[PDB]
Write a protein that binds this DNA or RNA. Structure first.
Ligand SMILES: [Mg+2]
Ligand SMILES: [Mg+2]
Ligand SMILES: [Mg+2]
Ligand SMILES: [Mg+2]
Ligand SMILES: [Mg+2]
Ligand SMILES: [Mg+2]
Lengths: 68, 160, 290, 159, 49
RNA sequence: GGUUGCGGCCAUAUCUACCAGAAAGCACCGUUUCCCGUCCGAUCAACUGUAGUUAAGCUGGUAAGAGCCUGACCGAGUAGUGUAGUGGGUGACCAUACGCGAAACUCAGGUGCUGCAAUCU
RNA sequence: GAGAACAGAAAUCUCCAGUAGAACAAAAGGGUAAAAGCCCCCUUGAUUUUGAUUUUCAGUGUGAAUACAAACCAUGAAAGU
RNA sequence: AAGCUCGUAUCAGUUUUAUGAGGUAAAGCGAAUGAUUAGAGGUUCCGGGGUCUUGACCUAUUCUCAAACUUUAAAUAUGUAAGAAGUCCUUGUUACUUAAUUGAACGUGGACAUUUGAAUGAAGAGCUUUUAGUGGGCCAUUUUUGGUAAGC
């Protein structure tokens, strides 16, 4: 927070610092993300993750996310 | 199920690639007339490269196509030089295969022999009306033609 | 095939995907002069399948094409032709049949009797003064290639000789040589009575008897020799000009009986509940630690 | 300098619709047009002959002439402070029947049917359309539909 | 809005007219809203006018 | 209901991978004297329906399939926008009043219909 | 993409995939797949007479373009163009 | 300015209902084209150092964009229609058109009156001749181009 506060002096105009309620850089809320990962619907792909959907062929959705 | 899907020779093509044109070219095309019994045709160069010595529409190469039972006979003549030995390569992923030789007096200028495999019912792809596509089970595979080449001529496949 | 490829793909017309209709040709065949309003243009459709020939008179409508008259080569046995249902002589007879069937239906049978002295001459059905003009149709060959000696022009000859005005030229009839711009009536007359087949029988029998029997097996069984198919072809033309009216084959079974038997060999769709059942069962098997 | 060619500024107007390129379907050529018919103009970009100018795109006119592969259409164009009559020769690919009046024909038919039905016994057939009228009184029951109270919600970021 | 006021015979300030309420006249009132004041008149108001 | 010829709308019809198909039809398939066309009777032309085969074409079904189509107070009355004030704010811009009103997203369902003629357990 | 003596990243031959990612004298934008692209065959309608119409517009001219009428022709089995 | 033909016929800088046209605002990039950040899993007889790393494409994801990009797509503006020059029944003309008394166009005769075909309004509507001045403009709200900006 202090690091972003010091960056505001370099910019014109008004900026605001907001504490996000998401989990990291994902578009999911923290409780929602915890719900999916405990169900084995989250796979680590590099620095980001991929999710398991209810669509598509089961032949591909089974080898991916074997725990589910 | 193999009631009718037997591998068959569709066509055999005798391709002679010559760098230049003129007296040299007609000398090479002269052999194909007596080698296959049919007059060949000449293919012009697509464009100019200025490095291989060819220019656009220069009539560099000659080829001829032969089918029927008069083609499997000369196919045998082309395999005696090869001694019924072929590499694991030379077999296309679509079921075709080919090989080349360096001299023509041995059969009875280098030449290239390429054989196209098919099955009965391939007319659906070639016919004008209601043109279709051959199904997957009816297609020719590399493993199918290699086995077919093993059964007849009692030939063998080289390493790998 | 990427998802983007399928999304931006434009499918052709169904009759073009199947490969049966040339829409470039169809547009010019059916488009009518707008100052003629609802005047229909009639197409003489000639089609050749294996061991069958189809001839139709068709006009176009928004809801779909409309058939005026039809003629099939499998009806030729009633007129005395049982063999060669797809050769040149069959096409001429089928073309002659459709011309007579259409004129009688329209009530114009008495006028435009065609030519009863066929000798391979190139002529057109001219109009009669102070009376109705002849019925006019345009030849529709579809995807057939235009070559001199093709059977589709043989069916054209029969329709024209039957009393229907069909505009055409003689440069696609057999007996036409490119060097000299004239038609040979003698060679053309041979083809109308199966001369090319009768000639084949005599030459093949004296060359290879084994080949003759296998090919012309039906002629031998029915006691038909090489110089008798012309006589039956002449009698068939006489029979066509007598009772060309179409009759339907008697149906042994009705539509309901036909439908009931065919339904037993048809596979039915599945409801949403059983489709959901199949995937649920697969999960319990593949994703259930066996 | 400026550019004011015949097809200027028609980059998007004359384009084909998405996944709708190729030849024209046959129903365009099978329709019949008569003098006095009401048609609307929409150019097809794949037929370069007999194509209207960009001004007449989206306009409606009356047929006055019928030819082999085209019709003549009359359009009223506003020039200055008045209207001038314009006559267009357009191929049938660029026009279609207008439904701005085809729907009016059935109202004429229904008016005659209603007039004859009430002719023997009824007076004041009332064959005139009327605009939407204010709603009449009604009674709203709360049986199983007890009103639910709502309140404004506080401000939240949820970014 | 100037045209709509003329069609309602409101050509000077403090002029008034009655309007029957339909879909065709409700849209007219929307166009001239910042120029007029209107409402629902009672029997007493109509009688005295 | 099956199938063939000619169609209408032109993916609910396409694409990928599999499975099944009685009858007839369609097709593959046989042949090179004749008309005809090729370097090659492969394509195209002609002849036979005879010698063979449902292997393919073709039709149907299968897939928490891709695409496509339809609907949903799913998102959202959100973005945007017409009109109004001597409204806010240094400004950038923003709120309110009377109206109109998206797209993506999410979820659910669907997977050609049909006209003319002929024919078939 | 997978193959064939010399032959190589580029010579010629074969198959598969391929909604146009090519080509269409030129600037750019439209349009086009049994074609408007490529190859082959035949041709001179790039012809004759004189009006109407669209665009710029004063509803003048000029340029260009559209649809017919009366002739004479080209091409194709033909509808047609 | 001079009037003329007529006396509410018909019209409207407006709404409504029915039916068209458009590619701007917005939106979109795990949709085409063109830009653009970061990893991850795969691929070589087809890049190069080294016996294993960096590049190059392939596939599935991820951050951010377009006056001369786009599937989708408003609001405001915009074309036409809402009857007597209309609808229906019968049948006359032609050298055009049809295989054909088929069609096309124009007519004879009969049937249907102004809740006669939505709303509102209408110091009346239509029409003609003639001629003055003017052809340096400027400002405000909203949209908007060049320019750091300007009472530009
Ligand atoms: Mg053609
Ligand atoms: Mg031109
Ligand atoms: Mg004000
Ligand atoms: Mg624009
Ligand atoms: Mg924008
Ligand atoms: Mg001055």
């Amino acid at each position: 927070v202090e690091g972003l506060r010091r960056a505001r002096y370099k910019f014109p105009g008004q900026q605001k610092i907001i504490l996000s309620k998401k989990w990291g850089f994902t578009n999911l809320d923290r409780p929602e993300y915890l719900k999916k990962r405990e169900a084995g619907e989250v796979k680590d792909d590099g620095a980001f993750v991929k999710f398991l959907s209810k669509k598509g062929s089961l032949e591909n959705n089974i080898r991916e996310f074997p725990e589910y | 199920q193999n009631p009718m899907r037997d591998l068959k020779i569709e066509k055999l093509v005798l391709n002679i690639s010559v760098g230049e044109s003129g007296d040299r070219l007609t000398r090479a095309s002269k052999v194909l007339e007596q080698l296959s019994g049919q007059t060949p045709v000449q293919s012009k160069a697509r464009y100019t490269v200025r490095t291989f010595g060819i220019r656009r529409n220069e009539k560099i190469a000659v080829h001829v196509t032969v089918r029927g039972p008069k083609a499997e006979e000369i196919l045998e003549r082309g395999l005696k030089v090869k001694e019924y030995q072929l590499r694991d390569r030379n077999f296309s992923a679509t079921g075709n295969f080919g090989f080349g030789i360096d001299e023509h007096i041995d059969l009875g200028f280098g030449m290239d022999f390429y054989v196209v495999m098919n099955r009965p019912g391939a007319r659906v792809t070639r016919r004008k009306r209601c043109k279709g596509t051959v199904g997957n089970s009816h297609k020719t595979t590399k493993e199918d033609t290699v086995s077919w080449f093993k059964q007849k001529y009692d030939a063998d496949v080289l390493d790998k | 095939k990427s998802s983007a490829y399928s999304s931006r793909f434009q499918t052709p017309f169904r009759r073009r995907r199947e490969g049966k209709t040339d829409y470039y040709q169809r547009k010019r065949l059916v488009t009518q002069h707008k100052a003629k309003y609802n005047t229909p243009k009639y197409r003489l459709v000639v089609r050749f399948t294996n061991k069958d020939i189809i001839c139709q008179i068709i006009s176009s409508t928004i809801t779909g094409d409309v058939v005026l008259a039809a003629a099939y080569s499998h009806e030729l046995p009633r007129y005395g032709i049982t063999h060669g249902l797809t050769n040149w002589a069959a096409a001429y007879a089928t073309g002659l049949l459709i011309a007579r069937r259409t004129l009688q239906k329209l009530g114009l049978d008495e006028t435009y009797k065609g030519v009863e002295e066929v000798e391979g001459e190139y002529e057109l059905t001219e109009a009669v003064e102070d009376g109705p003009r002849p019925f006019k149709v345009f030849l529709d060959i579809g995807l057939q290639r235009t070559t001199t000696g093709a059977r589709v022009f043989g069916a054209l000859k029969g329709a024209s000789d039957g009393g229907l005005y069909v505009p055409h030229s003689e440069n696609r009839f057999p007996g036409w040589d490119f060097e000299t711009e004239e038609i040979d009536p003698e060679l053309l007359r041979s083809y109308i009575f199966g001369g090319h087949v009768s000639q084949y029988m005599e030459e093949l029998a004296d060359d290879d008897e084994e080949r003759f029997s296998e090919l012309f097996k039906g002629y031998l069984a029915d006691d038909i020799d090489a110089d008798s198919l012309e006589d039956i072809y002449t009698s068939a033309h006489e029979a066509i000009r007598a009772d060309p009216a179409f009759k339907p084959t008697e149906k042994k079974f009705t539509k309901e009986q036909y439908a009931a038997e065919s339904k037993k060999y048809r596979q039915t769709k599945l409801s949403k509940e059983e489709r959901a059942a199949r995937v649920a069962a697969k999960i319990a098997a593949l994703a259930g630690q066996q | 300098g400026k550019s004011h060619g015949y097809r200027s500024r028609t980059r998007y107007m004359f384009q084909r619709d998405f996944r709708k390129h190729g030849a024209v379907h046959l129903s365009t050529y099978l329709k019949v047009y008569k003098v006095g018919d009401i048609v609307d103009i929409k150019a097809n970009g794949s037929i370069q002959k007999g194509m209207p100018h960009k001004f007449y795109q989206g306009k409606t006119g009356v047929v006055y002439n019928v030819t082999k592969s085209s019709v003549g259409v009359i359009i009223n164009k506003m020039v200055g402070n008045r209207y001038l009559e314009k006559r267009l020769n357009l191929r049938v690919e660029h026009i279609k029947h207008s439904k701005c009046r085809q729907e009016f024909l059935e109202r004429v038919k229904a008016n005659a049917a209603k007039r004859a039905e009430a002719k023997a016994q009824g007076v004041a057939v009332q064959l005139k359309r009327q605009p939407a009228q204010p709603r009449e009184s009604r009674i709203v029951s709360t049986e199983g539909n007890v009103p639910q109270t709502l309140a404004p919600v506080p401000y939240e970021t949820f970014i | 809005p100037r045209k709509v006021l003329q069609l309602l015979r409101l050509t000077r300030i403090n002029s008034g007219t009655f309007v029957k309420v339909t879909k065709a006249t409700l849209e007219l009132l929307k166009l001239i809203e910042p120029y007029v004041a209107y409402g629902y008149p009672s029997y007493s108001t109509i009688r005295q006018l």
